[PDB]
Ligand binder design. Structure first.
Ligand code: Y01
Ligand code: CA
Ligand code: ZN
Lengths: 661, 48, 81, 31
C-alpha cells in the first residue's frame, strides 16, 4: 500500500530560506546582512519551531542575541530555554507548540536543573515559589481544582515539590539545611503512599534529600564541628531528630558512630585493644556484682560506686544480669522439689514464687513508666514492646486467678476430680505461656553483638513476606476444611463407642477427625508435619464412594500444601534474603544506635528488683554550617566542571588566536 | 500562600575591576593581564 | 528499495524527503509465493522480515498513518503471531 | 522530546566546528 504523507510541515519562504542559515553559521558579516534585511522588512522559525532568538541562544553569540533584542523580536520563553541550556552568559544577557507546561516559572526550572550559579543569579532578584497545601487538604480551592482538572493539579504539585527539593536551593535559601532536608525527606516519603501514581518520583526525591543531608555531614574536619552540629537544639538533639525521621545513613556515618562509641564505652579506655578473653572476664565479673552496685547507688549516688552504675555499658550489663537471674529463677519453679503436694485446690505461694514476685512488679512499673513517658504513639512502634505488654498482662491475670482460687477453695481434693475450668488449671496454663513469652525476649539483646546482630536484623526483615504467604495458605486450608467437614459430618460417633473413651486425634487410635469444623481445621493443620495417619478417612459403615472421595480430597490437599506452596516459599525466601543482605550493616548500626541511646538517660538506672524500692549557640552553628556548605559546593562542582572546561578551552582558544594571527 | 526565597549566608561580592581581571585570566590573554597588573602596581587585586 | 533501508535506520529527515515522491511497498502474505519458496526459501524469508522491520519504524508510522496509536496496537499483535 | 534523549553529548557540534575549520584550512593552501 503506497499511503501518503498525512502530516507535513509548512515550507519556508525565500526570506525564510535566507534567514536562520546565516544564523546557523553565525558569521557577523552575515549578521550585518540580516540586520539590513530586517531594515528592509526575523521571527521565522525552523521546522523544530525555534525562532531566531532561540537558535541564537544555542549558538552562544551574545552580540547576535543583543542585536535581535534591539530589533524587538518576540522574547517568548527565551529565558526558560536559556535556563534549560544552562548557559550563564545568555541568562545574564536576557536578565539585562509550547515546550514547557504553563505553570513552569524560571526559578522552578532553575531548581530542577540544580545549577548553583544560575540559581544564585535568579534568587538575587528575590523570586518566590508558591507553597503547597497539606497532603490531606480539604478546602474549596483544592476540591475545585481536583474536580475541574486532576491531572494538571497533580503535575503542578509534583513540579513544586521537585523544585523545593533541590540541594542547591536548600543550601542557598534555608536557614537550617539539615533540618529542612530531614523534614522534606519525611514529607516526600509520606506523599508517595497517598499519590500512588507518582510513587517512584517521590521515592527518588526522598532518597535525594537523604543523600544530600548525609553528604553535608560528610564534610566535617574536626571533632569540635561534629559536636556543634550534633548538639544543636532549635544532649544530642540533632541525633534524636535524625532517629525520629528514620535517617539511617546519617546515623551510620563512621564519625558519628565513633563519637557514640566513645560516649557508650565511658570508664573503659582502650576497650578495643583488650583481648576478647579479657573482655569476657570483665563482663562476667561486672555482671556478677550487680546487687552490690545497685545497693551502693541506692545509698550513695555520688560516690565512686554510685557513679559506677551510671555509665551506659555497666548499666546495660547489670540489666542483662538481672534479667538472666530472673530467667534462672523461673527455671527452678518447674522442679518438683518446690512443690510439696499437688492435691491442694487453693495453694499458698511457694518460696520460688515469693522470690519471683518483686521482679514481676518491677517489670510492670518499668513498662508503665515507659508507656506514660513516651506516649501511646511511641510505645507501639517497637513491636518488641507488644510482647512485654502481653507477658505483663498474662502475669497479672495469673496473680488474680491465684488469689481467687486461694480465697474460694479451702480443701484438698483429688486432681482427677477437678472440673475443666478450675481456676488453678487456668492459672498454671497462663503461667506457662508467660514463661514462654519471657524466655523469648533474649533475642532483643543480639543487636549489641557485631556477629549475631546483622543476622538477627535480617531475620527480622524476612518475617513480613511469610505472613503474606500464610494468608493465602489460610484461604486454601479453609476451603479444604469446609469440603472435608461437609463430606464427613454424617458419621460422627460418641466417645463411649470408641476404645478407651477417646474422641479426636490426640489418641493412639485417631478418630472423628473430620466430624466438626474445629477438629477438621486441627486435623488439616497437623497433616503438614505428617502426624495424621491415613486410616482416618475410613468409614465404619464401609461405603466405598465416600471413602474414595475423602481420600482423593485429602491427597489433593496434601499435594497442594506440601509440593507447590513450600517450594514457592523456598524460592521467594531465597530471593528476598539476597536483596536484604546488601543493606544489613546500615540497618544493624541504626538498631544498635537506638539500643545504646536508651541507656544514656538517668531515668532507668536501677534494675527491676530494686526499682520498686540560645543566641550564642546559634551563631556558632551558623558558622559551622557556612564552612560545610562551601566545601560541599566545591566538591560537586569538581565532578561536573573540570573535563568540560578543559575541552572548551582547547578548541575555542585554537580557533580564534590563529584567526587573529 | 508563597515561600520567599532569599540568600541567608551572604558573602562580599568582588569589584568590577577584579571580575574583569578574573575573566581576562580565564580567557588566557596575557597582554590584558599584564596591563591590569601594571595598572594595579601603579595604583597600589591579584590576591582576590 | 532505498526507502526500505531508510526506514531500517529509523530517522525522520531522509524518510520525509524520500517519501515526498510517490512510493509504494508491497504487502506480505498464495500459489505463486509457494513457487518462489521452492526455488529459494532463505531469500524469501529474509525479504518478508525486511518489509516488516520497515513497517514497524516509529518514524514511518508517525508520517504515514492517520491513527499511530491504533496502528501500533494492530501491528504489535500481528508481529507476535 | 526524543531528540534530547540521544542528542545530549553534542560531540558532533564541536566535531562539526572542527570540520568547518579543516575545510577552511584545506581551501587556504589550495588557493
Ligand atoms: C541460648 C540459651 C541457652 C540462653 C543462655 C545463653 C545466654 C546467657 C546468652 C545468649 C545470648 C547472650 C547475649 C548475646 C550478645 C550480647 C552482647 C554483648 O555485647 C558485647 O560485648 C559486644 C561486643 C562486640 O561487638 O563484639 C554483651 C553480652 C550479650 C548481651 C549476651 C549476654 C548473654 C546471652 C543472653
Ligand atoms: Ca518496654
Ligand atoms: Zn487546600
Amino acid at each position: 500500500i503506497p499511503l501518503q504523507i498525512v502530516r507535513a510541515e509548512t515550507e519556508l519562504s525565500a526570506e525564510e530560506k535566507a534567514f536562520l542559515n546565516a544564523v546557523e553559521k553565525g558569521d557577523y558579516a552575515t549578521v550585518k546582512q540580516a540586520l539590513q534585511e530586517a531594515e528592509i522588512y526575523i521571527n521565522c522559525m525552523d521546522p523544530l519551531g525555534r525562532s531566531a532568538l532561540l537558535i541564537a541562544i544555542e549558538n552562544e553569540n551574545l552580540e547576535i542575541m543583543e542585536l535581535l533584542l534591539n530589533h524587538s523580536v518576540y522574547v517568548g520563553d527565551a529565558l526558560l530555554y536559556a535556563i534549560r541550556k544552562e548557559v550563564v552568559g545568555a541568562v545574564e544577557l536576557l536578565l539585562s507548540f509550547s515546550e514547557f507546561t504553563p505553570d513552569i516559572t524560571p526559578i522552578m526550572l532553575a531548581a530542577h536543573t540544580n545549577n548553583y550559579e544560575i540559581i544564585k543569579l535568579l534568587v538575587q532578584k528575590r523570586v518566590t515559589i508558591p507553597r503547597p497545601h497539606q497532603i490531606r487538604c480539604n478546602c474549596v480551592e483544592c476540591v475545585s481544582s481536583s474536580e475541574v482538572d486532576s491531572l494538571r493539579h497533580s503535575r503542578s504539585r509534583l513540579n513544586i515539590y521537585k523544585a523545593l527539593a533541590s540541594p542547591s536551593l536548600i543550601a542557598l535559601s534555608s536557614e537550617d539545611p539539615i533540618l529542612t532536608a530531614f523534614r522534606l525527606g519525611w514529607e516526600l516519603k509520606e506523599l508517595s503512599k497517598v499519590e500512588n501514581e507518582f510513587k517512584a518520583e517521590y521515592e527518588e526525591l526522598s532518597q535525594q534529600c537523604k543523600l544530600f543531608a548525609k553528604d553535608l555531614l560528610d564534610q566535617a574536619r574536626s571533632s569540635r564541628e561534629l559536636e556543634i552540629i550534633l548538639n544543636h537544639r532549635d544532649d544530642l538533639a540533632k541525633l534524636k531528630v535524625a532517629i525520629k525521621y528514620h535517617q539511617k545513613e546519617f546515623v551510620a556515618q563512621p564519625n558519628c558512630q565513633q563519637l557514640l562509641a566513645t560516649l557508650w564505652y565511658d570508664g573503659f579506655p582502650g576497650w578495643r585493644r583488650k583481648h576478647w578473653v579479657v573482655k569476657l572476664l570483665t563482663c562476667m565479673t561486672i555482671g556478677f556484682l550487680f546487687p552490690m552496685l545497685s545497693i551502693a547507688y541506692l545509698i550513695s549516688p555520688r560516690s565512686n560506686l554510685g557513679l559506677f552504675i551510671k555509665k551506659p555499658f555497666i548499666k546495660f550489663i547489670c540489666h542483662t544480669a538481672s534479667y538472666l537471674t530472673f530467667l534462672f529463677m523461673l527455671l527452678l519453679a518447674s522442679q518438683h522439689i518446690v512443690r510439696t503436694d499437688l492435691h491442694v485446690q487453693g495453694p499458698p505461694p511457694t518460696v520460688v514464687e515469693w522470690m519471683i514476685l518483686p521482679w514481676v512488679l518491677g517489670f510492670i512499673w518499668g513498662e508503665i513508666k515507659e508507656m506514660w513517658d513516651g506516649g501511646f504513639t511511641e510505645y507501639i512502634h517497637d513491636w518488641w514492646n507488644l510482647m512485654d505488654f502481653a507477658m505483663n498482662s498474662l502475669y497479672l491475670a495469673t496473680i488474680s486467678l491465684k488469689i481467687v482460687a486461694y480465697v474460694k477453695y479451702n480443701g484438698s481434693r483429688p486432681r482427677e476430680e477437678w472440673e475443666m475450668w478450675h481456676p488453678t488449671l487456668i492459672a498454671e496454663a497462663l503461667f506457662a505461656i508467660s514463661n514462654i513469652l519471657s524466655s523469648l525476649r533474649l533475642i532483643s539483646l543480639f543487636t549489641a553483638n557485631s556477629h549475631l546482630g546483622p543476622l538477627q536484623i535480617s531475620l527480622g526483615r524476612m518475617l513480613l513476606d511469610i505472613l503474606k504467604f500464610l494468608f493465602i495458605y489460610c484461604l486454601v486450608l479453609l476451603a479444604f476444611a469446609n469440603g472435608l467437614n461437609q463430606l464427613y459430618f454424617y458419621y460422627e460417633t460418641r466417645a463411649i463407642d470408641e476404645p478407651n473413651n477417646c474422641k479426636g486425634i490426640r489418641c493412639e487410635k485417631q478418630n472423628n477427625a473430620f466430624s466438626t469444623l474445629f477438629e477438621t481445621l486441627q486435623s488439616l493443620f497437623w497433616s503438614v508435619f505428617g502426624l495424621l495417619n491415613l486410616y482416618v478417612t475410613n468409614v465404619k459403615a464401609r461405603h466405598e464412594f465416600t471413602e474414595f472421595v475423602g481420600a482423593t480430597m485429602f491427597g489433593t490437599y496434601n499435594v497442594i500444601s506440601l509440593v507447590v506452596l513450600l517450594n514457592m516459599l523456598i524460592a521467594m525466601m531465597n530471593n528476598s534474603y539476597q536483596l536484604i543482605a546488601d543493606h544489613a550493616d546500615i540497618e544493624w548500626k541504626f538498631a544498635r544506635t537506638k539500643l545504646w541511646m536508651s541507656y544514656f538517660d538517668e531515668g532507668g538506672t536501677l534494675p527491676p528488683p530494686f526499682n520498686i524500692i540560645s543566641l550564642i549557640q546559634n551563631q556558632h552553628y551558623q558558622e559551622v554550617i557556612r564552612n560545610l556548605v562551601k566545601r560541599y559546593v566545591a566538591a560537586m562542582i569538581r565532578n561536573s566542571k573540570t573535563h568540560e572546561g578543559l575541552t572548551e578551552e582547547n578548541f575555542k582558544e585554537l580557533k580564534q588566536d590563529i584567526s587573529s594571527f | 500562600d508563597r515561600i520567599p526565597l532569599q540568600i541567608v549566608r551572604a558573602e562580599t561580592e568582588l569589584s568590577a575591576e577584579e571580575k574583569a581581571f578574573l575573566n581576562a585570566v580565564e580567557k588566557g590573554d596575557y597582554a590584558t593581564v599584564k596591563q591590569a597588573l601594571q595598572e594595579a602596581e601603579i595604583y597600589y587585586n591579584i590576591n582576590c | 528499495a532505498p526507502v526500505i533501508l531508510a526506514a531500517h535506520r529509523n530517522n525522520y529527515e531522509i524518510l520525509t524527503m524520500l517519501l515526498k515522491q510517490d512510493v509504494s511497498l508491497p504487502k506480505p502474505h498464495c500459489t505463486l509465493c509457494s513457487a518462489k519458496n521452492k526455488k529459494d526459501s532463505l531469500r524469501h524469508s529474509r525479504f518478508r522480515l525486511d518489509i516488516y522491520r520497515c513497517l514497524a519504524s516509529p518514524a514511518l508510522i508517525m508520517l504515514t498513518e492517520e491513527d499511530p496509536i491504533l496502528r501500533a496496537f494492530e501491528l504489535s499483535a500481528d508481529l507476535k503471531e | 522530546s526524543m531528540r534530547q534523549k540521544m542528542q545530549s553529548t553534542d560531540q558532533a557540534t564541536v566535531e562539526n566546528l572542527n570540520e568547518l575549520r579543516q575545510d577552511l584550512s584545506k581551501f587556504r593552501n589550495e588557493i
